[PDB]
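Q: Predict the assembly, please.
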Amino acid sequence: TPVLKVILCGEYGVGKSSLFRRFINNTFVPGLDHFEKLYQVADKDVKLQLWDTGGMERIASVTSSYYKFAEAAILVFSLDNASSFHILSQHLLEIVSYAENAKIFLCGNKSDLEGDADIETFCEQCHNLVNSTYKTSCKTGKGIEEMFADIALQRVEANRS
Ligand SMILES: Nc1nc2c(ncn2[C@@H]2O[C@H](COP(=O)(O)OP(=O)(O)O)[C@@H](O)[C@H]2O)c(=O)[nH]1
Ligand SMILES: [Mg+2]
Ligand SMILES: [Mg+2]
Ligand SMILES: [Mg+2]
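A: Predicted assembly structure:
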């Protein structure tokens, strides 16, 4: 079964490590850089290899090997902080530079602390670079399992086409 690499991108403090923890175990706490999980979508089984930055985005020392050979990139931003959504342009630039033809997904984390703005992605990038957007909350787990399931489904469908 194929192994598809999914990287977590975004600024420091949006909830990338919390999403990574939720992936490994459905846990929230107020290890390794990558974790593999097996999904079956219809006929095809795929192993999603989710990567976390390891806190290296705090010193802006995310190496180019983090983006290389990435089948997908999840741009995570906090729904209560509008700067985290504005700063995604640099991360998308690095992704495209080191891994073109990569599926870009958008994650709006901390949906329990928004009630800020960022209600419209407003075509952050064109030519349908964004495959789909998601609103998650690592504290309550809302929309996380659905997000990863839909990501696996979309990339199985894309690799079959
Ligand atoms: N309420 C709420 N808090 C969150 C959520 N995700 C993360 N946090 C909080 O944000 C803090 C830092 O998040 P962190 O995992 O370090 O994000 P990262 O460093 O960007 O990967 C943690 O202490 C969490 O308690 C969420 O979905 N909802
Ligand atoms: Mg982190
Ligand atoms: Mg970085
Ligand atoms: Mg800031």
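The longest strand covers residues 34-41. Residues 25 and 140 are 13 Å apart (CA to CA).
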